[PDB]
Amino acid sequence: STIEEQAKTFLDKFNHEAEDLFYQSSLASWNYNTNITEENVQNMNNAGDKWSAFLKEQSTLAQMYPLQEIQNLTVKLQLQALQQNGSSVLSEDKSKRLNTILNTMSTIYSTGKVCNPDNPQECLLLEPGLNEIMANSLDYNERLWAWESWRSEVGKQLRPLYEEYVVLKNEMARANHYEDYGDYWRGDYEVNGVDGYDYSRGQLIEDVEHTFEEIKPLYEHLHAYVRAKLMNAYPSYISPIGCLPAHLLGDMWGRFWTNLYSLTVPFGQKPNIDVTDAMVDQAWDAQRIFKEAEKFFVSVGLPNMTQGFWENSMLTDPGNVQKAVCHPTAWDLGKGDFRILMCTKVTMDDFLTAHHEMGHIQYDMAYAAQPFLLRNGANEGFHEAVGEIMSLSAATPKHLKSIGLLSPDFQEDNETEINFLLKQALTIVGTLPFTYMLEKWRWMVFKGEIPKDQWMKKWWEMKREIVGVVEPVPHDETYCDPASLFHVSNDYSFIRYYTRTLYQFQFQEALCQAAKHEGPLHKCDISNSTEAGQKLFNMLRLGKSEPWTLALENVVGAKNMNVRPLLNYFEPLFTWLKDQNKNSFVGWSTDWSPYA
Amino acid sequence: CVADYSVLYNFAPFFAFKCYGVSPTKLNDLCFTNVYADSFVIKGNEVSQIAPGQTGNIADYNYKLPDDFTGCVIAWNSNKLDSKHSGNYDYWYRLFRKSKLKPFERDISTEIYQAGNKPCKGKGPNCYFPLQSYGFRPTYGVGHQPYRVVVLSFELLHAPATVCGPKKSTNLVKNKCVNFNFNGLTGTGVLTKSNKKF
Numbered sequence: 001s002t003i004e005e006q007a008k009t010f011l012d013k014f015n016h017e018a019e020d021l022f023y024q025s026s027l028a029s030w031n032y033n034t035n036i037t038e039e040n041v042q043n044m045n046n047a048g049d050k051w052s053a054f055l056k057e058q059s060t061l062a063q064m065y066p067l068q069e070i071q072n073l074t075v076k077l078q079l080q081a082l083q084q085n086g087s088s089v090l091s092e093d094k095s096k097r098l099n100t101i102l103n104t105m106s107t108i109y110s111t112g113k114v115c116n117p118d119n120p121q122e123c124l125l126l127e128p129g130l131n132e133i134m135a136n137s138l139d140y141n142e143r144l145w146a147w148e149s150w151r152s153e154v155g156k157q158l159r160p161l162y163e164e165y166v167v168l169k170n171e172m173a174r175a176n177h178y179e180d181y182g183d184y185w186r187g188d189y190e191v192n193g194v195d196g197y198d199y200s201r202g203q204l205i206e207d208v209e210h211t212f213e214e215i216k217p218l219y220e221h222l223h224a225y226v227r228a229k230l231m232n233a234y235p236s237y238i239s240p241i242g243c244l245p246a247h248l249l250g251d252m253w254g255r256f257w258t259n260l261y262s263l264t265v266p267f268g269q270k271p272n273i274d275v276t277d278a279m280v281d282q283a284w285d286a287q288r289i290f291k292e293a294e295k296f297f298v299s300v301g302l303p304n305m306t307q308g309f310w311e312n313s314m315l316t317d318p319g320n321v322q323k324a325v326c327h328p329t330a331w332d333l334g335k336g337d338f339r340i341l342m343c344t345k346v347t348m349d350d351f352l353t354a355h356h357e358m359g360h361i362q363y364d365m366a367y368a369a370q371p372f373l374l375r376n377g378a379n380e381g382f383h384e385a386v387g388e389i390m391s392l393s394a395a396t397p398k399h400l401k402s403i404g405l406l407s408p409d410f411q412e413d414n415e416t417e418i419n420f421l422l423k424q425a426l427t428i429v430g431t432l433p434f435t436y437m438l439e440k441w442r443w444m445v446f447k448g449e450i451p452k453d454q455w456m457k458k459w460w461e462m463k464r465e466i467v468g469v470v471e472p473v474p475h476d477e478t479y480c481d482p483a484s485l486f487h488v489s490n491d492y493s494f495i496r497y498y499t500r501t502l503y504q505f506q507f508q509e510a511l512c513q514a515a516k517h518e519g520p521l522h523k524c525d526i527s528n529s530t531e532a533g534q535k536l537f538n539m540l541r542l543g544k545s546e547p548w549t550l551a552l553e554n555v556v557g558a559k560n561m562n563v564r565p566l567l568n569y570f571e572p573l574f575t576w577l578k579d580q581n582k583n584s585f586v587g588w589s590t591d592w593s594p595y596a
Numbered sequence: 597c598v599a600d601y602s603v604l605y606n607f608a609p610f611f612a613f614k615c616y617g618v619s620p621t622k623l624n625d626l627c628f629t630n631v632y633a634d635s636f637v638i639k640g641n642e643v644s645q646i647a648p649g650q651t652g653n654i655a656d657y658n659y660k661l662p663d664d665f666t667g668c669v670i671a672w673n674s675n676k677l678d679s680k681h682s683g684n685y686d687y688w689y690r691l692f693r694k695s696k697l698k699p700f701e702r703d704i705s706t707e708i709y710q711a712g713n714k715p716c717k718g719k720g721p722n723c724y725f726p727l728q729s730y731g732f733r734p735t736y737g738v739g740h741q742p743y744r745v746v747v748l749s750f751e752l753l754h755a756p757a758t759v760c761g762p763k764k765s766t767n768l769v770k771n772k773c774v775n776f777n778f779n780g781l782t783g784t785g786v787l788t789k790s791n792k793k794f
C-alpha cells in the first residue's frame with residue numbers, strides 16, 4: 001500500500017541476495033588469496049562481475065521508489081546507498097575512458113621500475129628497494145639519484161593521465177548531485193535525516209583548520225629537534241633553520257620520521273623493552289601470541305573468536321606454489337565467516353598488528369546481526385579506530401609485564417617511557433602536515449582554483465610551508481609527485497585517516513576515563529576493565545543506524561571532533577619538546593634552497 | 597504399539613530436545629492417544645522460532661502449532677550430513693511468507709510473497725517468491741547450519757490411548773510368602789507348582 005511496505009517487500013529478497021552473492025564473490029576472492037592460481041583469479045573476477053552486475057537489477061528498482069516519502073529512514077538510507085553505490089551517470093564512453101585511465105595508472109605505478117645509477121643493466125621496482133633504500137641507505141648521491149629518477153619515471157608519464165582523470169571525475173560529479181569530485185569526497189561524512197546531528201558539507205574545510213593551527217607549535221618543536229639530530233649525521237647538507245631537502249626523508253612520501261628513531265633518538269643507551277629475544281626462550285610461537293590476543297578480548301569482555309576462524313585462517317605462509325600475499329586484512333564475509341589472512345612472525349610488532357587486525361574482525365562480528373545494507377560503521381574511520389585503539393593499548397609496559405616475556409623486575413623511569421613517547425609522536429605528530437596538505441592539494445586541484453600550469457607550482461609552494469621540506473631538485477609540470485603516491489594515482493580518498501586519528505584518541509581516553517585508570521596516558525590497559533569494554537560494545541553492535549557525530553557523542557559526550565586527548569597523550573613529550581629546544585629556533589625558513 | 601522413550605537417550609544428545617506439555621519423569625509411564633512425527637530442517641538461529649504459542653517469524657511462515665502443544669520437539673544438528681561447500685541451495689524454505697499459518701499444515705502450498713501495488717504474484721518485485729534456498733555450508737558457524745528437527749507430539753485425547761510406555765518385571769520366588777502382581781491381580785500368598793489342566 002504505502003511506500004514503505006512496497007520498499008520493504010522489495011528489500012526482503014534483496015537483503016538475502018546481497019548476503020549471498022557478496023559472500024560468493026568474497027569467498028572466491030578469499031580462496032584466491034589463500035591459493036594464488038589463474039583459475040582462482042578467474043573465479044574471483046567472474047564472481048565480482050556477477051555480483052556487481054546483479055547490483056544493477058536491484059538499484060534500478062531502488063531508484064524506482066524515490067526518497068521523499070520515507071519515515072523509517074532505514075529504507076531511506078538503504079535506498080540512498082543503492083542509488084549511490086549501485087548507480088552511475090556517465091555514458092559508456094566516459095565510464096570506459098575513466099576505467100581505462102584507472103587501469104593504466106595502476107599498470108604504470110605497479111610495473112614502473114628504476115634502474116641502478118649510470119647503468120641500464122640492473123633495474124629495480126619501488127617495493128623491493130625504494131621503500132628500503134630511503135629507509136636504510138643514507139648516501140646523499142645515491143638517494144638523490146633514485147628519488148629523482150623514480151619520481152620522474154612515474155610523474156612524467158602519469159601527470160597528463162591524472163589531468164584527464166580529474167576532468168572526467170569533475171564531469172561525472174557535475175552530472176551527479178555534487179558540485180565537483182572534491183565535493184564528492186567531501187560528502188562521505190555527510191549526515192541527513194536527523195536534526196541536531198546533520199553534518200554540513202562546508203564545515204569540513206572549517207573544522208580541520210580549527211585544531212591544526214593549535215597543534216602547529218608542537219610540530220615545529222619536533223622540527224626543532226629533527227634538524228638537530230639529522231645535522232649530526234648530515235652536517236653540510238642541512239640549513240640551521242632552513243627548509244629540509246626532499247630526498248632524505250627516510251621514505252618516498254615523507255610520511256613518517258619514526259624510522260629515523262636511531263637518527264632521532266633522545267637517549268640511545270637505555271635498552272628497549274624487548275620481548276622478541278625472550279620469545280624464543282619461553283617456546284613462544286604464533287599460536288601462543290594469537291591465543292593471548294584472544295585472552296585480551298576475554299578479559300575485557302568482548303566475544304572471542306570462534307574455532308571456525310582459527311581452523312581455516314592461514315597464520316603462516318605456505319610457500320612453494322601455495323603462495324599468497326600476507327598483507328594485514330580483516331576479511332568481512334559474514335555468515336559467521338570472519339577470517340584473518342596475515343603471516344605473523346614471532347615479534348612484538350606482529351603482536352601489535354595481530355591485535356590491530358583482530359579488532360576489526362571483533363567489530364564486524366559484533367554488528368554482523370544488522371542488515372547487510374547497514375553493516376557499516378559510523379563512517380570510514382570508525383572501523384579503523386576499533387582495531388587501532390586495541391593496537392595502541394597493546395603498547396603498555398604493565399600489560400607486557402603481565403605477559404610474562406618481560407620480567408616484572410622491569411622498571412619505569414624517564415628513559416623507558418620518554419623514548420616511547422618520541423617514537424609515538426614521530427608516528428602520529430610527524431604525519432599530520434603531509435596528511436592535511438595532500439587533501440588540501442587534492443581539493444585545490446579538483447575545485448579549479450589553480451591554473452593548470454601552476455598545478456605543480458602550488459604543490460611546491462606549500463611543501464616549504466606546511467611540512468617545512470623543500471625539494472632537492474625542482475620539479476615542473478612534467479613531474480607529478482602525488483602520481484608516485486598510492487591514493488592519488490589510484491583515486492582513493494585520503495580524508496579517512498585525518499578523522500580516524502582524531503577519533504581514536506577520544507575513544508582511548510573514554511576507555512581510560514570510564515574505567516577509573518590513573519597514571520600517565522601512555523600507561524593504560526583495558527584488559528582488567530569492564531565499563532570501558534561494555535561502553536565500546538554498546539557502539540560495536542549498533543551499525544549504520546547512527547551517524548558519526550551521534551556515535552562520537554556516545555563516546556565522550558561530544559558530537560564533533562577534538563584534539564585534547566592527542567595533546568594529553570604527548571603532554572610530557574610536549575614539555576620535553578619545549579624544554580630541550582630552548583636555544584633552537586621555532587619554525588622553518590621557506591625561502592632557503594639547498595640546491596644552490 | 598509400545599513406545600519406549602529411552603531410545604533417543606541411547607542416541608546422540610539432541611540440542612534443542614525440549615518438552616512443554618508433558619511430564620518429563622512420567623514420559624516412559626504415560627499413555628497418549630496417538631503420535632505425530634513432523635520432521636523438518638531448520639537453521640540454528642530460527643530453530644526456537646518453531647515454538648508453541650510463541651510463533652516466530654519462521655513458524656508463521658513455515659509451520660505453526662497451538663499454544664498448548666503437548667509432547668516434545670526434538671532438534672539436533674545435521675551440518676556434516678546435510679552441508680556442502682557449494683551451498684545447500686537444494687534445501688529451500690519459504691523465508692518470505694506473508695501472514696500466520698495454522699498447526700499441522702505443510703507450506704508445500706506456496707504462499708506467494710505479494711505485498712505492494714503490484715498484483716504481479718508469482719516472482720519478482722513486490723510479488724516475490726516466498727521460497728529461499730538455505731545455501732548451507734559445513735564451514736558456517738552457529739545459526740546458519742541445518743539443525744534437523746522433529747515434532748513428536750504426544751497427543752492424549754478422547755480416543756483411547758493404546759500408546760503407552762513399557763513395563764518391566766522381576767523374578768519368580770516359590771514357596772515363600774510374597775506380594776504379587778500378574779497383569780493387575782493384586783494379592784499375597786505362597787506360590788507353588790500345580791497340576792491343573794487349564
Ligand SMILES: *[C@@H]1O[C@H](CO)[C@@H](O[C@@H]2O[C@H](CO)[C@@H](O[C@@H]3O[C@H](CO[C@H]4O[C@H](CO)[C@@H](O)[C@H](O)[C@@H]4O)[C@@H](O)[C@H](O[C@H]4O[C@H](CO)[C@@H](O)[C@H](O)[C@@H]4O)[C@@H]3O)[C@H](O)[C@H]2NC(C)=O)[C@H](O)[C@H]1NC(C)=O
Nearest residue numbers: 085325326327328329330331332356357360376383384387
Ligand atoms: C561501495 O562500493 C565500493 C566498491 O567500489 C566499496 O569500496 C571498497 O571498500 C573496501 C573496504 O574498505 C576497500 O577495501 C580496502 O582495500 C584496502 C587496500 O587493500 C589492497 O592492498 C593490500 C596491500 O596493501 C592488499 O593486500 C589487498 O588485497 C588490496 O589489494 C585495504 O587496505 C583495506 O583494509 C583496511 O581495513 C581492514 C579492516 O577492514 C584493516 O584490517 C586493514 O589493515 C586496512 O586498514 C580494505 O580492505 C576497497 O578497496 C574499496 N573499493 C574501491 C574500488 O575503492 C565501498 O566500501 C562500498 N560502500 C559501502 C559498502 O558502504
Ligand SMILES: *[C@@H]1O[C@H](CO)[C@@H](O[C@@H]2O[C@H](CO)[C@@H](O[C@@H]3O[C@H](CO)[C@@H](O)[C@H](O)[C@@H]3O)[C@H](O)[C@H]2NC(C)=O)[C@H](O)[C@H]1NC(C)=O
Nearest residue numbers: 004008011071072073074075369370371645651652653654
Ligand atoms: C523500521 O525499520 C526497522 C528495521 O527494518 C523495523 O525493525 C523491526 O521491528 C520489528 C518490530 O518492531 C522487529 O520484529 C520483532 O522481532 C523480534 C525477534 O523476532 C520479536 O521478539 C518481536 O516481537 C518483533 O516481532 C524486527 O525484528 C525489526 N527488524 C530488525 C532488522 O531489527 C521497524 O519495525 C520499522 N518500523 C516500523 C514502525 O515498522
Ligand SMILES: *[C@@H]1O[C@H](CO)[C@@H](O[C@@H]2O[C@H](CO)[C@@H](O)[C@H](O)[C@H]2NC(C)=O)[C@H](O)[C@H]1NC(C)=O
Nearest residue numbers: 031032034035036037038039040041318321322
Ligand atoms: C590450489 O588450487 C589448485 C588449482 O586451483 C589446486 O590444484 C589442484 O588440486 C586438486 C586437488 O588435489 C587436483 O585434483 C588438481 O589436479 C590440481 N590441479 C593443479 C593444476 O594443480 C591446489 O590443490 C589448490 N591448493 C590446495 C592447498 O588445495
Ligand SMILES: *[C@@H]1O[C@H](CO)[C@@H](O[C@@H]2O[C@H](CO)[C@@H](O)[C@H](O)[C@H]2NC(C)=O)[C@H](O)[C@H]1NC(C)=O
Nearest residue numbers: 299398399400401402403404408525526527528
Ligand atoms: C588482570 O588480572 C590478571 C589476573 O587477576 C593479572 O594476571 C596476574 O598478573 C600478575 C603480574 O603480571 C601475576 O603475578 C599473576 O600471577 C597474574 N595472575 C593470573 C591469574 O594470571 C593481570 O596482570 C591483570 N592485568 C594487568 C594489566 O595487570
Ligand SMILES: *[C@@H]1O[C@H](CO)[C@@H](O)[C@H](O)[C@H]1NC(C)=O
Nearest residue numbers: 297298299303304305306307
Ligand atoms: C572463548 O572461546 C571458547 C570457545 O572454545 C569459549 O568456551 C569461551 O567461553 C570463550 N571465552 C569467553 C570469555 O567467552
Ligand SMILES: *[C@@H]1O[C@H](CO)[C@@H](O)[C@H](O)[C@H]1NC(C)=O
Nearest residue numbers: 413414415418575576579580
Ligand atoms: C627524569 O625524571 C625525574 C623524576 O624524578 C625528573 O625530576 C627529571 O627532571 C627527569 N629528567 C628530565 C631530563 O626530564
